[PDB]
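Why do we bother with a discrete structure alphabet at all? Because it lets us treat a fold like text: something you can write down, compare, and reason about line by line. To make this less abstract, here is a complete entry for beta trypsin. Read it the way you would read a sentence in a foreign language you are learning: slowly, and without expecting to understand everything at once.
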Amino acid sequence: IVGGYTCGANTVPYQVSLNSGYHFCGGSLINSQWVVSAAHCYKSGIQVRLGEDNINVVEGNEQFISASKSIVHPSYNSNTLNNDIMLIKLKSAASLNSRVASISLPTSCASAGTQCLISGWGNTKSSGTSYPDVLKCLKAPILSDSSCKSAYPGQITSNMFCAGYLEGGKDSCQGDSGGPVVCSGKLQGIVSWGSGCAQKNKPGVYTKVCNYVSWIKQTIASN
Ligand SMILES: [Ca+2]
């Protein structure tokens, strides 16, 4: 996250770190046994890390659980990033408490102008690289579909939304992918793609979770 603030340890209890020997993407806990992330974050041998603040120090609230199965959306297109969503089932159920909790799925799609919270351990500079050890947060509004399409002509589908600031300076960045966009207590987006980070007229692009509720519930119910 560029231009954000330090969340504070365990203040975003549904935030997960996906680890394959190092942190590579964020995720969101949706129930005690399932995580939602970005399909572009798919790999085999994922370890889900819950209750993290500093990803380099065992502080005492972590739960490390291996994934038992991963399911990329049936229509994921890696060239266009359309349907950039995946489900990961944990080998065992996480223990839920104040610091490890699930985020609720939306019953309605959020509108342009709604303020949301975006979080992750990604790069913090738009120029060069500096990866934080502790969870970073950014409050950003959902942009109008019109704004979004004008920033990225021919690339936004109905399963994507833009969030951020057209003036630049504040955005998600590398390593934030798969992380949550929460608006009014519901998971509305997944950090998916962008052009650079925090550049003027190039806000981050997010997977629109409200379009996938049916797929998520059906999938959880049978696996
Ligand atoms: Ca830790």
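What the structure line is telling us, in plain words: Residues 13-102+211-222 form a domain with the Thrombin, subunit H fold (CATH 2.40.10.10). The chain is about 10% helix and 30% strand.
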